[PDB]
Symmetry: C4
Subunit: 388 residues, 4 copies
């Protein structure tokens, strides 16, 4: 009935507890589970759901062959009940395309899907399950967006888009929507030099997005958005605890206003919670590939170029495949604070496991606890040999 306002701070994060896990690849070995990738989680006022980009085929289906490909006409943003797998029979299509974001403003949900060829892509903005606005490519080079939830304040939902090179300067815009309509957009400002796939969360201070620099940087760029003034700034996480993948080894001095060098033209979507002494960063354990996942408590990581971990938690062992990760919170939960949450995409199949011809994933998700909880590890759990 009313637009949600960001009126709370983050809860104190002392550990992470299991929130959701769908075991989609295990189950999909023998049931009609859709091939997906680029998953996320997003809450409505009365329900939280899993989201992902379908590939328009099941895993056991013959059309799973070739699903390493990123952008076909057979992709769509789907949602399904928390911790169920994405099945043909339980998945709700939000919009058609191969790059997405979605968020609820307290009244209704906005979902955005981009489709088209590389040089002529377009975004369609849906609100309350109807198409409301459209945005054409401005740089004619793979218009693309967050691949995780956006965040709203008093009806205003900012979204970060990029159009242009994946290996050099590109044209990033921040759009501000209300009820699906474009209030305003602005070109990226600040010191971030390349922006992709922002993972965002909101709290009383404003909206914070942790993104992927695909060009030169292995530190992560950050965009901080004021959804009331509809303005933003950008920089990088200052910490020498580097969180992109692949990436160099951790130095003792990070970079606040420029890419930390060593790995070019690659990256992975990731996230962080930047909150002074309550700061936690996510990253793959491997510096070379999308394997393992850990959380590290790094005080003042955003602003302190010498900051190091003082606590951590393993989420996925280095022996197990990970992938994309992103932030979300249940803005409609009871209490005095917003509980930080995240998901990790657990990619199976190609390119790392090429005895099968498909690429898909499952999801694991955690939220923060004020307790100091014991840790487990959370693999996808499927045996590739079963699919041969």
């Amino acid at each position: 009935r009313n637009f949600n306002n960001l009126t709370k701070g983050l809860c104190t994060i002392n550990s992470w507890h299991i929130y959701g896990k769908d075991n989609a690849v295990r189950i999909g070995e023998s049931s009609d589970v859709l091939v997906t990738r680029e998953p996320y989680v997003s809450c409505d006022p009365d329900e939280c759901r899993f989201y992902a980009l379908s590939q328009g085929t099941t895993i056991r289906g013959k059309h799973s062959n070739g699903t390493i490909h990123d952008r076909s006409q057979y992709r769509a943003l789907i949602s399904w009940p928390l911790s169920s797998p994405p099945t043909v029979y339980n998945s709700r299509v939000e919009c058609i395309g191969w790059s997405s974001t979605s968020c609820h403003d307290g009244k209704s949900r906005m979902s955005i899907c981009i489709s088209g060829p590389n040089n002529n892509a377009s975004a369609v903005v849906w609100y309350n399950r109807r198409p409301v606005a459209e945005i054409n490519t401005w740089a004619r080079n793979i218009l693309r967006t967050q691949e995780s939830e956006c965040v709203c304040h008093n009806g205003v939902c900012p979204v970060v888009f990029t159009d242009g090179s994946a290996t050099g300067p590109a044209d990033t815009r921040i759009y501000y929507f209300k009820e699906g309509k474009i209030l305003k957009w602005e070109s990226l400002t600040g010191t971030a030099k390349h922006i992709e796939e922002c993972s965002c969360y909101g709290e009383r201070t404003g909206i914070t997005c942790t993104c992927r620099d695909n060009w030169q940087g292995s530190n992560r760029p950050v965009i901080q958005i004021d959804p009331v003034a509809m303005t933003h700034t950008s920089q990088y996480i200052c910490s020498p605890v580097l969180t992109d993948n692949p990436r160099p080894n951790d130095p003792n001095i990070g970079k606040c206003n420029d890419p930390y060098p060593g790995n070019n033209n690659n990256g992975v979507k990731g996230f962080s919670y930047l909150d002074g002494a309550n700061t936690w960063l996510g990253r793959t354990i491997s510096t070379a590939s999308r394997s393992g996942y850990e959380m590290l408590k790094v005080p003042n990581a955003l602003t302190d170029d010498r900051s190091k971990p003082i606590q951590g938690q393993t989420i996925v062992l280095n022996a197990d495949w990970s992938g994309y990760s992103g932030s979300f919170m249940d803005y409609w939960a009871e209490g005095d604070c917003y509980r930080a949450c995240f998901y990790v995409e657990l990619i199976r199949g190609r390119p790392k496991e090429d005895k099968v011809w498909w690429t898909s994933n499952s999801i694991v998700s955690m939220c923060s606890s004020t307790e100091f909880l014991g840790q487990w590890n959370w693999p996808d759990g499927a045996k590739i040999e079963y699919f041969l």
Copy 2:
């Protein structure tokens, strides 16, 4: 709570954006997807859904053999959630039969299904999911109707029916229903010489239907209906941009009041939006077969027998199979105007692909944008070889 009134004009159509796509044949290669044909889309005040005539078997099921056939006892009008495929487990049966139409009046939905042998068919009119009225065949020769949504104004929902020859003069009637009851019917008047499978939409001016002349014409007949007076007129689209299939090549002078000659005893269901300078016509790209699909902006196509395109958009490449197409709009969307939408049936299997023994389809659907959006193309996407 209240009957919908047609109080708005069409939004300005400057391009078309992706609205829905179910990838039904791809998914049905390995899941329980019903064989269908003659699909459409129709909105309720709170949801839009896909519709089609099931064949009462799945694609992988052995009973898919022989589904090129049009009129069996195993067919039914089904509906299912937007962009999901029509599965055994998610499809809702609206009524039983092999020719249909359906529309919501703002309070409840009317669905009409025709069944029976060729010489003794009958229509059953359902309203709010209950049978309310029945109409017996009047010419004893395949009583048949729109195969896409009807349109309502202040509770009155006109529907076009034909009974009689597919290859000569037939008996077409326009029925006017309210809450499923027959208010009135009238015989076709005007200059259209053969009428089948009308695709309709409504706006403040009245209801406009673009139909199929199966006898002599390769231009499309148009019926214009006043749902208040409950009267109609008919003619053909005057434009030399011919939109039936198969069809002759485009001349420079069309025909307003008679069939444009060249192809007899054949046709395909199609649609148009006739709105002065905002006029757009749909057609297959091929003049010979149901392949490809394009939209063409043809100013005053209804009334100008010299009118030619000034803009266009490819929807499906000529290399890919298409099929039926029809109009629908979300009459319950926010805003100052009604956004034109359409679907294209993408037929797979027989007769064109006879290495399989079945005939089915998937759906792609677009709505108009006031932006000039880049275009993609939207194939069914299934590989026939996988079904062998």
Copy 3:
């Protein structure tokens, strides 16, 4: 909110129109469709649904072997959406057992299921999805009930039960329930000599049940129930148009107060609408087996021992298998009268088709029209060879 009252007469029946059909055996050849038998249809104030006794296995499942058997621990009353098939994923279990009835009183639904061994069976009465009352066997010989819907008036829902011999005198009781509680029961009175599987409907005059005499009669017994006084009478349909199966050929004089002789120890569940000159009887076409189905207009069939047909309609050809049939009506439909409806069970498999090891069925259902509609025929439609 309020209990339904039977305040209307039957609509004039001039023909029958298609209402529902699930094609369950066709679809179940390749999808997870439950094996069933003894189906029926019953309406809530907001929805009508199919009902049947599951066998606790799918058709393609190996446990379908042996499903000719009537009474296992794996049976349950299930319901599912109108004209969908009964699938593992869409079927709602109403109660556990191998003989059932169910009806909505305007506020909530009562469902009754009998389970147990032959000598120790018991009925459990559910109301608003909770068990409320239980009834133990009184004759210790296969306690059994209607296998189609009951009917309610002002909260009172009468149900006919039989316990005792299938081949001689048995102990039949009429129970009167309200909100699942037993108000009263009475022993059968009148001239009916054996009662099984009553098919009932209600109108302003009271409740009329047409049953099966399994002992000596090939005419059908009738029980007429006053749900206000909670009393009943019984006799047989007087008409020489005999409607049990198997049965002798039609004579010119029927029997009002005794079994018409010729076939012993057998029968089939059936139904009729007894309404003076608006009387219609259902029967199998074959006199020997459960094949074919037809409706016959037989004026005053209940009371006139010379009555013959003056009109009819074929529903299922004699070449096709039929089975059980029963009555139901949508008591919550709009209008001045109740529209008579019925279903026919289309049995496939054993004993008639013994190349498969299972027994199941599909459903076809019709309702009456005041029009004189053309007739089709409605086979199950499955090819047995596909299951081999």
Copy 4:
């Protein structure tokens, strides 16, 4: 809207009637049924549902291999509609983990799931489908809980947990939750010497839990909880009718305040209804293995160390496999009393049936009747050979 209060006594139990049965293993031979174990039943004010711990694979899926294992990362508490089987498409995930309980307080449902390695497990407490509180292991040895429903009074829901040895003294705590928050916890007091897997029910006197002593006892420990004062006591069922499995033969004197000896380091979850002369105990028929199930009326079993049966009912024949059993009631049913109910887990597969590589179960459930109903027996019904 209001918290449920325990204001009624138990209905008089004179026999047991069939309540639910899902036939999950039969159906799962050919449909997408999840492998489960540790099932139970629990009611909301408007619905009752089946619950269990999924293994994150279907039975026919290759990942069913190894599902005898108790604690993997692929387990979750799921719920699904009463008497349906737990399918991929109909199961709702309540939380992630390998030990659970769940209960509705009249306003919303609390669900608790424990996950983690043996030495670092943690409980997450969910309320109204959101995580609210977390509890870390206190003895670092397989933190574990009830595996059946908890019970609430005026918002307070007590839950019994154990952490520590399965073969010697352990650390049992009773937690008191309200809206998912921890009001209080206390260490176990009284004479019970080992506590696992409590089965609880509530009535006006308070909450009664019947548990499993896995250390030395083959009588069952009982915890009696006052949810208002938030205090408890414990002892054993005094009766010589012993109800653990495996167990010694029944003596003539039981033990009230110590384990009855004979079988060490083993047990099974079970239940009882302790209500003076209305007392009924459940147990496996076999003293050696989890086979058969019976109910026995044993007056004053809780307090009388000489008490013997005066009536009984067989639920599952000794020839058929059983397993876990537990209590639940529909606290929201109409009437003057609470109707006692229970479920029995019917385990199939390993270790007893090792020709298959999986372990799963189906469910049968009964509630009490004031009638003296005839008894049947209720096997799982699946043929193991079909899975080979």
